[PDB]
Amino acid sequence: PKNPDLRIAQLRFLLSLPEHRGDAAVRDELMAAVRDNNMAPYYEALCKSLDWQIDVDLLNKMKKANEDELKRLDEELEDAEKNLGESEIRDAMMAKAEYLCRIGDKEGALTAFRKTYDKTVALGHRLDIVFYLLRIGLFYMDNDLITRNTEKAKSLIEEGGDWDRRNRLKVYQGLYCVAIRDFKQAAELFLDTVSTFTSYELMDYKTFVTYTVYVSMIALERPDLREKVIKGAEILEVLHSLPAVRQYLFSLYECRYSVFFQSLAVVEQEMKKDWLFAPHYRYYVREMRIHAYSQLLESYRSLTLGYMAEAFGVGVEFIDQELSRFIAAGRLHCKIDKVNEIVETNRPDSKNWQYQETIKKGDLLLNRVQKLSRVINM
């Protein structure tokens, strides 16, 4: 839900896999378990927790408090029923669904948000229900259930984009677009960060900037950064929060690998141990290394091993297999030269290949018109 129990219960990823940081997560998890009715989440995730000595102590109180608040919400729902009114019943069933989201049960919250989903007097309240399903869909990390209500509730707005409602849906677009590997369409989502504010519901502002600095720093080239973020005052204002981001931006834009490789271990360690950003940590590393190799190798035709080894600050035996794997596997440039131990490429990818970029659509289109010939008479 929108309560801090989404983040406290969201730290279960770093609570489960690593055993070193599993002390603070169980510290604020066990301490914060008495808040927002955290019984069912940690009881389901009890396998990654301590023994049953202190576990069975508070369960007797939480199981009766859950029934007390549940029967009080049922009494309020019965008092609001059989009466002339729309917002009262929607607030009763909606509050019951919010408590059922606090306990973490999507069955009674599924039928509850289905009933109040059918009692929507306007489309804005319906989109609010959709967001109420997204705030728990982030914890449940479901794929289609979060795209169905947004795909159906996306069209037919007719009321214009609000300041933080449509921007909040844009933040959700940043969430599911950072989860997926789609970047060329996600590089335009965070452009409205000026209207964003500190939203304790899903992600803090510093966490939103910290999460978008990877897709923006890697998924964008130098002109895209110079136009979008370098020209904008957003990163110019928020760079003072953490001095490291300024180093990873001025070092990458300045093409200084001596500090980039020495300080890249912080990006490697911080990149993992995250809820939604950890399973994709391998794509940012390789994509950023091939992006930097294409950046430096773009303006450089021939490169000796001296200036390259001194520039990157690493042995030749490692960049040898690096380029060996990234020429065939990565497919970034043409054949490499090693007759004089000097990387020398040609890259004839403009004159003839610029016209040869359509031969793929010509061959696939040729098979497609062969299928068109297959449709003939059958």
């Binding site: 789609d182 271990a265 490697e268 391998r282 794509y283 590393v285 690493v314």
Partner: protein, 33 residues
């Protein structure tokens, strides 16, 4: 997109045996290599 999972699985699975991360080792390989 399952199209990118071929390269991500190629390099990710390729490095699953040894030198998985290798980013933490460069700091020790700078002075030795």
């Amino acid at each position: 997109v399952w199209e990118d999972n071929w390269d991500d699985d190629n390099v990710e699975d390729d490095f699953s045996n040894q030198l998985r991360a290798e980013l933490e080792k460069h700091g020790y390989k700078m002075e030795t290599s």
